[model samples]
Target: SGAIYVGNYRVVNRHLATHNDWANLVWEDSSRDLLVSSTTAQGCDTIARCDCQTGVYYCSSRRKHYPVSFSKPSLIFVEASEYYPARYQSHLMLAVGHSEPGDCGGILRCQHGVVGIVSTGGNGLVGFADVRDLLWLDEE
Candidate 1:
């Protein structure tokens, strides 16, 4: 699936894909901070800086998408405990999170900028789809 980072929550960018659980909607903005999608094959991190338009605001049962800003946001990087299940292993990058089902599809932000998006979570683990993966599908 694809989504746009509008406010706090995400709305489906267009249509869903079989393998993709997250897609980044690049918007046209002056601030060009690198959006780190995921780790590269060479162990180097890949970054993207682009701009497009905006998408519709997304909402859920009790949550609503709202515009908000941060003040001197502090970037905190979390370490991944391990990979996801074998079936989805090839689809996403897994990380240790609170593992709430509702947390999926949320934006993973840091000092560098928006890095990744939450995909699936449970049993104390959450899968994240990198922005790079969302933008341009990569190879193993």
Candidate 2:
């Protein structure tokens, strides 16, 4: 048997606001392009590019570790964690920010089961560099 059928469907529309929003909802692709382009345009000296696909950003400088001769090795060590995984093992190291003669020394070290940030004349810090899960600990 041959028969003709008629049907009707409803269409819904939505309006999105673009204010202080970080998620990729509207203009997602465009936004991503803009972000990457801006990051690339800002010059490699200030920022670095990591695999956005993996959510890892790296420092632009090729040097893994800074010379320990700076007066303020603290900043150097602090910035080292920027490139090396703070809580995991990695062959690469990084230091960021200005390195003055007496600005303090900073160093990020990676090892089994622990990644650490150490500074001269300061407290030693450690964490999970490659951890992908949530964490809860005492503030003190």
Candidate 3:
């Protein structure tokens, strides 16, 4: 979905569907972000979030949800390799990470939480052992 970026945030996706076109996205606060799920009686049924909130069915959680950022952060390299946070396989990083979706992916469910890049051209973290020891750095 091609979204129109307004500063750091973007519309990401828009819908003109039979069901009420998603939620009216608004920044009620500086920190508040998006939440998930779906519509139409049938549509809502499968949406993990919708089902959970309505008590129809809880979303199948793959990992325990936790904060992505760390209080005692460390500097580390985030290369374009596959050695993710010792947890996921992993196609995704953190919600606070850097990357958009791709062509043909699987449904990943993790308690998303947080990113960083410290090096170039490597497959693994240069020194650190886990994602908790890392912090994101945006190149300006």
Candidate 4:
């Protein structure tokens, strides 16, 4: 259900909503100029635009800014098959430190192949079990 698209072009790769979180714009009616990411429970949702005038990448609502040339993050998707090998389980969990909440990124948690939110002490957790996967927003 969470496939990524830019304008009308589908990017099989990902573009994050936050540092390591999924954009979560798949279900929303998004503006071509503003690629929405995630909104925090406290109200500061992250969004981005690659073609803004002030910068190459832009997002607002909480005053967050990152120039596309200055901040570069790469997205990587990980499948349970690659890690678990022949061993399988009903519940799987992966984790990293406190980062942004995600819809598509993690050791990002899951159940029955859907993206889910896991509690982080800011030490976050991830899993989706079985054939599901997680995304890692590789920041360089």
lDDT of 3 at 87: 24
- Candidate ranking under TM-score, highest first, comes to 1, 3, 4, 2
lDDT of 1 by residue, 39-101 (tens): 212433333333211211112322544222221212223333232222322224455444344
Winner on lDDT between 1 and 4 is 1
lDDT of 3 by residue, 1-140 (tens): 12222222222211211123345333211111121223222211111121110111011122222223321222333433332222222111222322222201112121331121111112321110112221211100
What would the TM-scores of all predictions be? 0.37, 0.15, 0.19, 0.18
Q: Per lDDT, what order, best first?
A: 1, 4, 3, 2
List ranges where model 3 is wrong by over 4 Å: 2-19, 22-32, 35-38, 44-98, 101-107, 110-140
Off by over 4 Å in 4: 13-140
> Candidates 1 and 3: which is better by TM-score?
1
Q: RMSD for each model, in Å, please? A: 13.3, 21.0, 14.8, 15.4
- Candidate 1 residues lying further than 4 Å off, grouped into runs, are 6-86, 89-91, 133-140
| Of 3 and 4, the candidate ranking higher by TM-score | 3
lDDT of 4 by residue, 6-97 (tens): 23222121223344234443322111111233333332212232222122211222233232221121122333332123322222233332
Worst 10 residues of 3 by lDDT: 50-59
Q: Report the number of backbone clashes for model 1.
A: 5
For candidate 4, report its TM-score: 0.18
Ten residues in sequence with the least summed lDDT for candidate 1? 27-36
